[PDB]
Amino acid sequence: SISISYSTTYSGWTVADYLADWSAYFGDVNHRPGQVVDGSNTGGFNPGPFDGSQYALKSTASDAAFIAGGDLHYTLFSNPSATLWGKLDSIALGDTLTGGASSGGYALDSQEVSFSNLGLDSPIAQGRDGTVHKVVYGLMSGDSSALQGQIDALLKAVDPSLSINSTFDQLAAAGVAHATPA
C-alpha cells in the first residue's frame, strides 16, 4: 500500500492542504515552449541525461524542491515528444536540493513529506496523458492536483474512510504513515 513519511511539524495538516500549499509556494517553473532553460527550469535525472531512477527539480525562485523516484524516461524530442513516462514509486517534497548524477543521487536537506509505493506505471504510448507525466509535470507547474488524485485513490484502496482530507496523524493511526523528526 501507499506509505507516507512526514515530519511531525505536519502532523495536524491534511494531505490536501499540505500539497496545495507546498505546490503553490514552489510555484510554476514555466517549463513551456520558449521558456525552457537548461540548468534553470529543466531539473535533472540520476544518472541521466534523460533517464534514471530519480528526477529532481528545484524552484530557483526559491530552494523548494521535489524528487521523483522510480524507473523514469523522458522522450525529449522523440515521439511522443516531451513525455515523462515509466514507473513512478515515490515523490519527496521539501527544500534544499542536494546531489545529482555526479553524486550518485539527489536528496533534500530538509525533506518534509514523502509518498512511496505509488505504483504508477505509464507506457510511452500514453504520451502526455500518462499518469506519471501528469503527476510530475503538474508538480513542475506548481500544481499538485494530479498527485493528490493518485494519493486519494491509493488511500481509498486501503480503506474508503481514508483520503487526502485525512490528517497525517490520522493516516499514521490507520497504518499508512509514519512521522519523522521535525
Ligand code: HEM
Ligand atoms: C532533463 C530534463 C528536461 C529537459 C532538458 C527538458 C527539455 C525540454 C525542451 C528543450 C523543451 C522544448 C522547449 C521549446 O520548445 O522551446 C521541453 C518542453 C516540454 N517539456 Fe521538458 N525537459 C526536461 C524534463 C521534463 C519533464 C520531467 C517533463 C514532464 C514531467 C517535461 C515536460 C515538458 C513539456 C510538457 C514540454 C512542452 C512540450 C510542448 O508544448 O510541445 N520536461 N522540455
